């Protein structure tokens, strides 16, 4: 478990100064700290930190990675490759745990929702509708963290089973404020919190499709 | 990200600070407090601190400090610093400690 | 007449750890400070200090 923190400064002149409208500067500065803490938690979950020996979810050495042909190749949609690879990933999760775990959640890049909206030829209902009809009981969502997975434009898709006994995030201490410590003519307020990152108990229930 | 990376002093390097006592952050091994790898540390950059010594005689107040290659004070060490001796000189049970004053790099 | 003094430090994490595990640290540090004060008084009485005359 690790601890997080920052601080902010404010002066009596700025406190006394008034404005036409809007939230006060103290409130805005206090909200900025909470936003920064939440963003740091997300960044620890999705990116890791080498010096602190925190392993990200894309760099875990015990999960299954699948190389994929590109779904979009120079504005040329391939709506069958996506379905084939998704079915392959689901079957891999099914057959790697010997039937004790079934895939339930898919996360895809937000820019690839156009591939799954194509009408299948010589019919009405789309590829996504056919996939849902054949695999009723699964949830598909979009995450912007998947647009880039290694800093160079590499995309990916994540298929997993959401279950507390398989993986979870701990936040033992919530975000809080400490009393200001006055100086000559200004103040100072520190902020602290705690977190742990992401831990996986069964790394055989997660599949990452890279290169998409 | 802004996190500094620290490690034990070696030959021909430049000291930056001294690890200080903490009843929560430190881990107990070989009957001593240490900082295990991949964990936060408390480095000290200014003020008076007690440091382990390998010398046999008391130093001179206000003189310059010289360290060994393992991060311990020695009368004729090789690594030169700008820190000073703050005057203190004592001995716990079979451990030699000396009071050294630190200023910012 | 003369005057004495000392101090000690402690952190929030240490305070919480002590109150959770049962044994605190502030009580021990305060006891050490008080005993040091009393020992200094006794040493001053029975040995004195030349620079302070």
């Amino acid at each position: 478990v690790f601890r997080l923190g920052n601080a902010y400064l404010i002066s009596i002149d700025e406190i006394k100064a008034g404005q036409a409208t809007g939230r006060p500067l103290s409130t805005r500065k206090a909200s900025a700290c909470q936003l920064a803490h939440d963003q740091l938690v997300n960044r620890l979950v999705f990116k890791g930190s080498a010096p602190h020996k925190i392993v990200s979810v894309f760099n875990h050495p015990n999960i299954t990675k699948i190389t994929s042909g590109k779904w979009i190749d120079a504005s040329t949609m391939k709506p069958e490759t996506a379905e084939a690879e998704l079915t392959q990933a689901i079957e891999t999760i099914e057959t790697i745990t010997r039937g004790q775990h079934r895939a339930t959640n898919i996360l895809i890049p937000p820019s690839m929702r156009k591939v799954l909206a194509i009408r299948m030829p010589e019919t009405t209902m789309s590829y996504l509708d056919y996939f849902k009809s054949q695999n009723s009981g699964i949830e598909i969502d979009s995450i912007a963290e998947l647009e880039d997975i290694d800093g160079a434009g590499t995309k990916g898709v994540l298929v997993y089973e959401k279950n507390p006994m398989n993986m979870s995030i701990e936040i033992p201490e919530a975000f809080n404020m400490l009393p200001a410590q006055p100086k000559d003519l200004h103040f100072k307020v520190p902020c602290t919190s705690k977190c742990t990152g992401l831990t996986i108990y069964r790394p055989m229930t997660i599949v990452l499709i890279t290169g998409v | 990200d802004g996190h500094k990376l620290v490690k034990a002093l070696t030959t021909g390097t430049t000291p930056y600070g001294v690890a200080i006592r903490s009843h929560w952050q430190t881990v107990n091994a070989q009957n001593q407090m240490i900082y295990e790898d991949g964990g936060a540390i408390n480095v000290m950059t200014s003020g008076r601190v007690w440091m382990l010594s390998k010398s046999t005689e008391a130093p001179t107040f206000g003189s310059a400090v010289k360290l060994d290659v393992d991060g311990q004070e020695k009368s004729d060490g090789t690594i030169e610093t700008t820190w000073t001796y703050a005057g203190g000189w004592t001995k716990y049970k079979d451990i030699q400690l000396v009071e050294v004053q630190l200023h910012q790099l | 007449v003369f005057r004495l003094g000392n101090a000690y430090l402690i952190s929030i994490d240490e305070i919480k750890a002590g109150q959770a595990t049962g044994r605190p640290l502030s009580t021990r540090k305060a006891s050490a400070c008080q005993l040091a004060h009393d020992q200094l008084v006794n040493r001053l009485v029975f040995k004195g200090s030349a620079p302070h005359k």
């Binding site: 006994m165 108990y201 | 009843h23 107990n28 009957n31 407090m33 | 750890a17």
Partner: peptide
């Protein structure tokens, strides 16, 4: 001997769940 006043076990947690390997029969 210059250790702290808290041992590791006092600041340690054991998760209340065990994982069992599975061997399907056939």
């Amino acid at each position: 001997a210059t250790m702290g006043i808290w041992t590791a076990q006092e600041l340690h947690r054991i998760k209340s769940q065990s994982y069992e390997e599975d061997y399907p029969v056939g």
